[model samples]
Target: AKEIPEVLVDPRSRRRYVRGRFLGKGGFAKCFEISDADTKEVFAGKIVPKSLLLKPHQREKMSMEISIHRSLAHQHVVGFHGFFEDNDFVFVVLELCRRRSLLELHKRRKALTEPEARYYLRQIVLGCQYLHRNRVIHRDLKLGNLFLNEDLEVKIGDFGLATKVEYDGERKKVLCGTPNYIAPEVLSKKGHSFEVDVWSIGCIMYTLLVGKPPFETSCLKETYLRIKKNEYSIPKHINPVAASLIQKMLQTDPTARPTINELLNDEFFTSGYIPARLPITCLTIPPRFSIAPS
Candidate 1:
């Protein structure tokens, strides 16, 4: 009985879309490549069964996600076209990123070069900074959420756990966020703020450089313990500047962590070679950069 209709119509815009190939899936939501019936403009259709959102809290969460996502307008953030519901499912139209996500890239290429990481990290920092300015906190920032377009640009997606804070002093005690990237403060139940996102960026940087998440272990209990104790070792091969930057962001004390503004000006980014753009070959093979004299 659960099936995606070929055509979806948005009542507000009166726009009709034709569902195409399946793009991906997460949780209960499944994504499909869809196109406008008339304009033929393509988008990612995130479809969810109404049965999954039958509970009041689940419905509220979905509404919050859409509200936060729609208001965001940044090049590195996924574009939200519109949303509508049919008798069986709710469809959300989003920007179509054909190249999939950084998780896929990480799976193919275990680790990435510093220059390539620098190029991608810069865009992520910019997009994250924009979110902070708008009072939105992306509680769940992970490799899978960082999508790539045909141009090889990274776009932050998936805001199911994102929340908006009204005041600077406001803090949330929600034990949310991905395991490897979750901040220590979140687990301590002391409440947390924007600094949590900064902590996640550090994990992202570490994963991109080292091929695996810092504090990752065979046991989930041990992994959480390591995160709480702030105990993760950077490989000796990683650049000192880059490793130091990661240390600063992974501080046990959230207040001690560097802000997004400080991240851009860090020695790792300042002293390293940051490519203005990356090539498509980076998907399978490493990119070649004119290394500056060490």
Candidate 2:
């Protein structure tokens, strides 16, 4: 997502129905809150403007997204209700997470206490583990992409940039994702793989501990340089367990970064993490709607 700014309506309905206020805009989509007329259920709608896609490859990427989300059924993952299309846009209906995103919460409360941060981090790890097990790579894994439900349980979102790995190969080059949370191999334009997601997790953990990203700088070029060198210092005040986990995730060599399965076994996550007990919801398509395989 390259930070484009624009508001486009659903291509199919063209009925500009008003719902809740605008939440946030990303490179490829804008999110809004809406209420289902029949059930009176409130939901978040992510509108992806097909006009914004300039290249054929971009459309292919969009198709890949629909395929990936359709096959992935996990409790920690954000639920994809269905896709609606009109002449101008593609609208994706998602479960509304009323508690807002982790990024917004972190901004309000500068730093989280150990227990509080661990609670959120554990949920994220579980979500990532589920994705990895399904052979999917969540190219973007940041605080903003992690949403909290009414019960304060975390659900991973933003599948617009996710991809699937076909083979157990080394780094496969694909330059994508937010710069601040990007892995070193990605910045270098080299082939990268699923480990990039773990690197982003490290950045999120670092930010949670210190209230800032490790590679912050006034100049974009200088910031990339710092990240390329893996030049960042951890404050002494951070808990030892948190720091150790971050170190393992942020390893300079992509091959050396710990896998999601390995991370689940780490002492920091295994010793103190408690899974949420909320009722798990599954994605359901109405009987009338027909879905074709990709």
Candidate 3:
């Protein structure tokens, strides 16, 4: 018999659950570690109080995120179990990643060595490839939105910026994503295709090899121009293959960029390949990083 899951249940909701612990709070919702009594499994649960979801736009945005997330099921992406709501609270259940977001790890490590960069990025590339295959585009891809599971495997989360493509050659016009990671086409306010995600991945790869973004600038005006012109340097000591791949993905013309299929075949990932392994010691939970992200 599976160990009993704390024999917990919510009387109001009539669902057996144990509020394992508190997770962090975000603008629209807060999350917690929740246990399923019957399954003896742990899951991350995001809670959004109806009082907090005041505006129609706010609720609409969340609904869109949930819709997109539900459609995706991949190892490189977070697993969305389902969602439910009561008069006071709305809940979204997701697979638990014990170490939280990659932002925390990146901050501690400063930058990953080339091999380590390749390890994490290969998974990111695979995840992005899967998303594109499904005709979905992740408008926002950043380290902070990436979570690391107990096994030190990476999973891309936060689909609030993801959207569906209606047809081939269809483009999106929304100006979205964090500043440094945004593609030039998006900055131009011209419609952009799935290639925008390729640009974002390029930026992410660059940031991983170096400690900061390629086109990071003090002035937003200059930042826009820099990205439009594809003006940035691949700093010294970057792996030659990785640098070459970055150049191809960061092309000023969206059509010039390589597709995800092409990127996966590149030597950067295939050469000097080390099967990613997580150290048992490093996998243990620390109190500081207890909160798992969605």
Candidate 4:
């Protein structure tokens, strides 16, 4: 492995760190808010110690993450501004999302209202669609990875576990992703596909509507069994259309899971569910539609 660089900041810059308190920490990284001294812009930075990623395999995975983030472009996906290198760490500059994670929101608010849930779900689906279209599979798709920007738009982040599917043969035995959100096939070690992400999205949607995961057990083994067995029920309070959509998304067989394109046609999503009231300008809107005269 190559020798890691040392941490260094511009000597004259006093505002390297932003004013806000430390948000939270992940297994491999620490997140902090910071203001760019030159741009005077607020941003969030995730620092991963190079020592932690020094192993050959770890370095390869980190390179993949950087490529995935660089290739993807979607409003509902977190944007990667750039990376900063120090001798011992890698600093990833990301768009500052002031609001807490969806996990935090769920813990604080319990469950979301139908409209609110749908709004976030729509953005998630859109982001997933973009990833899938580009052949990327977000192996981990959970509420904790979904961030809310200052404007309240949900941006899916954390592409560390993501992989690009080059062919049908890409599916192979590999245990990756959060246990609770793992697809049935993934847990079975029977090889999985991009649909694993769809299953996770279903789990997230279920939690958004009901305050808990679809399959809950006292122990990890039991939970894994339930996920593998597809043992879960939609709450009676959930709308029929929404429940149906979740069911399709969480299908036990990867082949049966709803594809991102298919999700766009889901009744629960297409039934006049607006994400936000943002205006659609000529440049942003597709050429297929014409703007009406004011």
Per-residue lDDT of 45 in model 3? 81
lDDT of 4 at 268: 84
TM-scores vs. true structure, each candidate: 0.96, 0.83, 0.85, 0.84
Best to worst by TM-score, what's the order? 1, 3, 4, 2
User: Candidates' lDDT values, in order?
Assistant: 0.89, 0.75, 0.78, 0.76
Flag clash pairs in model 3.
none
Measured on C-alpha atoms, candidate 3 has an lDDT of 0.78
* lDDT per residue (tens digit) for residues 1-294 in model 1: 688888888888999999899876877799899999989899999999999999998898899899999999899998888999988898899999889988999999989999989999998999999999899989788899998998989899889889999876898977433544888898888899899999999999999999999988888878888898889899999989899999999998999999877789988888889888887888998977756656
Where does candidate 1 have its weakest 10-residue lDDT segment?
173-182
Query: After best superposition, candidate 2 residue 226: deviation in angstroms?
Result: 1.5
Misplaced by over 4 Å in model 4 are 1-20, 176-179, 272-294
Q: Candidate 2, residues 21-65: lDDT per residue as tens digits? A: 687785688888865555566678777887876678888877777
Task: Give the candidate number with the greatest lDDT.
Answer: 1
- Please give the ranking of all candidate structures by lDDT, highest first, separated by commas: 1, 3, 4, 2
Tens-digit lDDT track of model 4 for 150-170: 666789998888888888658
Q: Is candidate 2 or candidate 3 better by lDDT?
A: 3
Which 10-residue window in model 3 sums to the lowest lDDT? 282-291
Say which prediction, candidate 2 or candidate 4, comes out ahead on TM-score: 4
Q: lDDT of candidate 2?
A: 0.75
Q: How big is the positional error of residue 146 in model 3, measured in Å on the Cα after superposition?
A: 1.6
